[PDB]
Design a protein around this ligand. Structure first.
Ligand SMILES: CCCCCCCC/C=C/CCCCCCCC(=O)O[C@@H](COC(=O)CCCCCCCCCCCCCCC)COP(=O)([O-])OCC[N+](C)(C)C
Ligand SMILES: CCCCCCCC/C=C/CCCCCCCC(=O)O[C@@H](COC(=O)CCCCCCCCCCCCCCC)COP(=O)([O-])OCC[N+](C)(C)C
Ligand SMILES: CCCCCCCC/C=C/CCCCCCCC(=O)O[C@@H](COC(=O)CCCCCCCCCCCCCCC)COP(=O)([O-])OCC[N+](C)(C)C
Ligand SMILES: CCCCCCCC/C=C/CCCCCCCC(=O)O[C@@H](COC(=O)CCCCCCCCCCCCCCC)COP(=O)([O-])OCC[N+](C)(C)C
Ligand SMILES: CCCCCCCC/C=C\CCCCCCCC(=O)O[C@@H](COC(=O)CCCCCCCCCCCCCCC)COP(=O)([O-])OCC[N+](C)(C)C
Ligand SMILES: CCCCCCCC/C=C\CCCCCCCC(=O)O[C@@H](COC(=O)CCCCCCCCCCCCCCC)COP(=O)([O-])OCC[N+](C)(C)C
Ligand SMILES: C[C@@H]1CC[C@@]2(OC1)O[C@H]1C[C@H]3[C@@H]4CC=C5C[C@@H](OCCC(CO)CO)CC[C@]5(C)[C@H]4CC[C@]3(C)[C@H]1[C@@H]2C
Ligand SMILES: C[C@@H]1CC[C@@]2(OC1)O[C@H]1C[C@H]3[C@@H]4CC=C5C[C@@H](OCCC(CO)CO)CC[C@]5(C)[C@H]4CC[C@]3(C)[C@H]1[C@@H]2C
Ligand SMILES: [Ca+2]
Lengths: 92, 92
């Protein structure tokens, strides 16, 4: 689950924030939102950052259209496969 | 699941956006919100677009009152039946 998380969190932060010097925030921002997705928070108005109803209209730029596709795959794997695999373990 | 999705996404976009020329957005807007519903995002302030607490007060018009009924059926089928059918598969 933590691997699937970084599989998603690192490409997202890299696509959306491409002018980042090294910082401790980079360690927070690759775990924070991907973790709250596990609990069904999809951050609906932040997925497409070039949409008109975006809450993040300023990080629109090249490649950012990739992040919906990424998150669609992430949640299917994380929210459906991996959480219910853990539940299946707990059921046993 | 993708069929149930378009069963809902196409009537919604057609009822709510009736003056649309052909566009690539039509391909996004028939998949985008119906997919995030699968993960429990109901877009609560967008369902009834003629309600006072609406975030979409401008797409109010004829037929738009049909879209709550549509989405009520969609999520029951998608969120409850189809996701837990997939989970039941995964459990086996
Ligand atoms: C045993 C269970 C798991 C394994 C254990 C190991 C887990 C690994 C743990 C990793 C921790 C992540 C690194 C933290 C360090 C960076 C924070 C920091 O310094 O800066 C940030 C602050 O940070 C905070 O205020 C705290 C944020 C912590 C979030 C942890 C919970 C999220 C889920 C995590 C769980 C995932 C587990 C995955 C499981 C599926 C902000 O940056 P800044 O530079 O301070 O900015 C200052 C300016 N400002 C005030 C405007 C902000
Ligand atoms: C099912 C429902 C879908 C319909 C199906 C048919 C596919 C339809 C697809 C057709 C592809 C053509 C559409 C893109 C043309 C450019 C338009 C555009 O603005 O793009 C935008 C992004 O997107 C891109 O730049 C490219 C997106 C490609 C995604 C399609 C992958 C294949 C989908 C499955 C293939 C189907 C068959 C296989 C299925 C098993 C440009 O950018 P932006 O995001 O606006 O923001 C960035 C910054 N900006 C604003 C400054 C620019
Ligand atoms: C293998 C598993 C699935 C089967 C495979 C096939 C999957 C089918 C995939 C279909 C892809 C849909 C077509 C997208 C391309 C058209 C959009 C476009 O060109 O422009 C849009 C950009 O688009 C984006 O920024 C990305 C949007 C992609 C959303 C994908 C995630 C949702 C779930 C998908 C998965 C659900 C699948 C169902 C599963 C239950 C914006 O519109 P525009 O006109 O560019 O507007 C420009 C102006 N603006 C800047 C203000 C915006
Ligand atoms: C169970 C709890 C419910 C009570 C039960 C009894 C049913 C009560 C129902 C009674 C029906 C009469 C009410 C509507 C009258 C018009 C009023 C109106 O403004 O309508 C609005 C919507 O709605 C419609 O336009 C029609 C809605 C019909 C829905 C009923 C389906 C059957 C439900 C089950 C039947 C029950 C028994 C079977 C059960 C197995 C029109 O306007 P708007 O949506 O605001 O926006 C549009 C644009 N505008 C603002 C510019 C106008
Ligand atoms: C045309 C669709 C073709 C048909 C669709 C199907 C083909 C799919 C292929 C491609 C989809 C189409 C890509 C075109 C993007 C157009 C927008 C663009 O230029 O965005 C940006 C560049 O974007 C790039 O340079 C993207 C480069 C490709 C990335 C690699 C994709 C690999 C997919 C892996 C495949 C695995 C698939 C899944 C496996 C199961 C720049 O423009 P902007 O966004 O406006 O940014 C602001 C620009 N500014 C700096 C001037 C301010
Ligand atoms: C009164 C009802 C009594 C009982 C109803 C209950 C019985 C059901 C029957 C009917 C529901 C009642 C509809 C009333 C609509 C009133 C509002 C209206 O006119 O809206 C609009 C038109 O709306 C239409 O023209 C709708 C036409 C019916 C669509 C087909 C329904 C099929 C239901 C399938 C059944 C399957 C059931 C489920 C199967 C298990 C116009 O008004 P507006 O919204 O203000 O728009 C702005 C107008 N403007 C352009 C001037 C600015
Ligand atoms: C197998 C796994 C692959 C992924 C991973 O684990 C192992 O690999 C680790 C490497 C880590 C980075 C190493 C160095 C730094 C530099 C630091 O810069 C100083 C700050 C500055 C403040 O301004 C001083 O003044 C910022 C943090 C950063 C980028 C780490 C982030 C987390 C990373 C990416 C970790 C990640 C979870
Ligand atoms: C069995 C399944 C039934 C549903 C479905 O799959 C098969 O049937 C497909 C047919 C597709 C449309 C075909 C043609 C176009 C024209 C294009 O217009 C150019 C843009 C313009 C920009 O301004 C050029 O300049 C916009 C897209 C659109 C409407 C398609 C949308 C997706 C649709 C509805 C697909 C949908 C998922
Ligand atoms: Ca939820």
């Amino acid at each position: 689950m933590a691997l699937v998380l970084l599989s998603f969190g690192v490409p997202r932060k890299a696509i959306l924030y491409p002018h980042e010097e090294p910082s401790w925030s980079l360690a927070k921002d690759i775990v924070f939102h991907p973790y709250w997705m596990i609990f069904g928070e999809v951050y609906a108005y932040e997925i497409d950052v070039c949409a008109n109803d975006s809450t993040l209209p300023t990080i629109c730029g090249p490649g950012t259209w990739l992040t919906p596709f990424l998150q669609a795959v992430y949640l299917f794997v994380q929210y459906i496969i991996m959480v219910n695999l853990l539940i299946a373990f707990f059921n046993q």
